[PDB]
Structures are given as structure tokens and as C-alpha cells.
Design a protein around this ligand. Structure first.
Ligand SMILES: CC(=O)N1c2ccc(C3=CCNCC3)cc2N(Cc2ccccc2CO)C[C@@H]1C1CC1
Length: 113
């Protein structure tokens, strides 16, 4: 019933959509934390100080870590920003990030208030 609750319901709906099969073709790189060691990315944690991914956002939502929509959105955008910072702009993953961020931003804009 509360404003913060309702807005976080909207955030949770968005999160569910981002993780859904509908968007899997471009969402998959963002499902789990970047495993720098697995991918041979030995500079990743020197360049990306605050890693983020959708599983972490999900855990934080489930743990009631996010106190408002703004805090949730900051993590989702951090995830995209990290991708844009680390990868060259012509990399496949950047195109995927842009597409998933489009999904995010347009639905986030429909926030109840
Ligand atoms: C999230 C993120 O920035 N990354 C990213 C994150 C996760 C994963 C994987 C997830 C599941 N297992 C396979 C790899 C792969 C990437 N890639 C590689 C990747 C992405 C998409 C298409 C093709 C490739 C191959 O060049 C890039 C980048 C990394 C350079 C930071």
C-alpha cells in the first residue's frame, strides 16, 4: 500500500522481466557476476571497482536491501555502466547492454507516483 512498497513492486516486476526468456538473447551476459578469472580478464577488477549483475540485484531485492526505487535503479545502471566502461564500444556485449538498458529505462519510466 505504501509508496516505497508500490514503487519497489514495479522495480521487482522490471527485474523479473530482465531475467525472463523474452530478453534472454541479449540479457544472458548480465545474469551472473563477471568471472574475471574464468574469462582471463586479469584487469577487470582494477578497472571495475563495483561489479554488478542481475543475480546480485535479485539477491538484494529479496533481502530487502533496496529501500527505494532509486537505489535499485542505481545498481541496474551501474551494471550497464561497468559494461560500457570495460568493453570497447563496438563489442557485441555493448550492443546487448544497450538493448537491455532500453528495456529497463522505458519500463522504469512507467513508475507509479
Ligand atoms: C558482462 C560483460 O561485460 N561481459 C561478459 C559477461 C559474462 C560473460 C559470460 C557469461 C556466461 N558464461 C560465458 C561468458 C561474457 C561476457 N563477455 C563476453 C561476450 C559477451 C557477449 C557476447 C560475446 C562475448 C564473447 O566475447 C564480455 C564482457 C566481459 C569482458 C567483461
Amino acid at each position: 500500500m505504501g509508496k516505497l512498497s508500490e514503487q519497489l513492486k514495479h522495480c521487482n516486476g522490471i527485474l523479473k522481466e530482465l531475467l525472463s526468456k523474452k530478453h534472454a538473447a541479449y540479457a544472458w551476459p548480465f545474469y551472473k557476476p563477471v568471472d574475471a578469472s574464468a574469462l582471463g580478464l586479469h584487469d577487470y577488477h582494477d578497472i571495475i571497482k563495483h561489479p554488478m549483475d542481475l543475480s546480485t540485484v535479485k539477491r538484494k531485492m529479496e533481502n530487502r536491501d533496496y529501500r527505494d526505487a532509486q537505489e535499485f535503479a542505481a545498481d541496474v545502471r551501474l551494471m550497464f555502466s561497468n559494461c560500457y566502461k570495460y568493453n570497447p564500444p563496438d563489442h557485441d556485449v555493448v550492443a546487448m547492454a544497450r538493448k537491455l538498458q532500453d528495456v529497463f529505462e522505458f519500463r522504469y519510466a512507467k513508475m507509479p507516483d
